[PDB]
């Protein structure tokens, strides 16, 4: 077992992961409480926001901690049932969060560029959210169906035992399709929508602040989610790299970079809206 790390190289990673998990969870749950605890805020306009907050909170709580504690030593501790559940639900959470962000972008685009048309109905909003969750579950199911557990000398691991094939086509296609559906499409959609909205918008200081925040959202998504996909596309290019000690360090780095993104929406809302600021000040 060459993945047993020393004490300090582990403590240093542990502190960095703790900061992001704590801030993400607290911020997301506080915003979710803010939207729902007051009748003034409880409106159809905030359904996508609450859905996104719930998705982000579940993502941070479940995916990050388990992935970290597995990556530290690369030894599984929970058993077959949890190895099954972990490859099913926390990944659907990620997909749902990304597509909820896309829905929020679409709502803002419609509200700004076509102000004279009536906004979608409550039933339509609810159906859209349900469809989002159903698609996330459907796309994440195969990864969890074939999850298993295997014993080794001094190790027991939880991995994905894909059906055997000489050229490995079945999982190549799955990974390529996941990349396409999770990185290139939402990125293109949000980039177009926010581009048009910013061009239209650019007291003008408030509009320009909105544009600046909008640029930050686009850029942070694009920069943060790239190496995450590159890491999982790499083994079908060069498998030998996954037999060296440097690989777990690379995995930790890219995973921290990807998972840090759950921190920014609560801060953006606070820096933009005095109502959210007052809500936070009353909560604390």
């Amino acid at each position: 077992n060459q993945f047993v790390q020393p004490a300090w190289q582990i403590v240093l990673w542990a502190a960095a992961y703790t900061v992001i998990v704590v801030t993400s969870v607290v911020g997301n749950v506080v915003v979710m409480w803010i939207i729902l605890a007051h009748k003034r805020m409880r409106t159809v306009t905030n359904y996508f926001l609450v859905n996104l907050a719930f998705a982000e909170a579940s993502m941070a709580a479940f995916n990050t901690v388990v992935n970290f504690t597995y990556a530290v030593h690369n030894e599984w501790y929970y058993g077959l049932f949890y190895c099954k559940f972990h490859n099913f639900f926390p990944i659907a959470a990620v997909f749902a969060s990304i597509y909820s962000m896309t829905a929020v972008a679409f709502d803002r685009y419609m509200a700004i560029i076509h102000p004279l048309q009536p906004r979608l109905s409550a039933t339509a909003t609810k159906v859209v959210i349900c469809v989002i969750w159903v698609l996330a579950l459907l796309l994440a199911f195969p990864q969890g169906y074939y999850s298993t557990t295997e014993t080794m000398p001094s190790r027991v691991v939880c991995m994905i035992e894909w059906p055997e094939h000489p050229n490995k086509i079945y999982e190549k296609v799955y990974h390529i399709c996941v990349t396409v559906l999770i990185y290139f499409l939402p990125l293109l959609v949000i980039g177009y929508a926010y581009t048009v909205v910013g061009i239209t918008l650019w007291q003008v200081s408030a509009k320009r602040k909105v544009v600046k925040m909008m640029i930050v959202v686009v850029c942070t998504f694009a920069i943060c989610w790239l190496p995450f996909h590159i890491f999982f596309l790499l083994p079908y290019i060069n498998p030998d790299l996954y037999l060296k000690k440097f690989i777990q360090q690379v995995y930790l780095a890219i995973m921290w970079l990807a998972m840090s993104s759950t921190m920014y929406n609560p801060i953006i809302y606070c820096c933009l809206n005095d109502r959210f600021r007052l809500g936070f000040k009353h909560a604390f």
């Binding site: 992935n67 690369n74 490859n87 080794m152 190790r155 939880c158 890491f231 999982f232 996954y242 037999l243």
Partner: peptide, 11 residues
């Protein structure tokens, strides 16, 4: 099964 040295990173 794959090997003793593999890392097995997960999403």
């Amino acid at each position: 099964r794959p090997k003793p040295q593999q890392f097995f990173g997960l999403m």
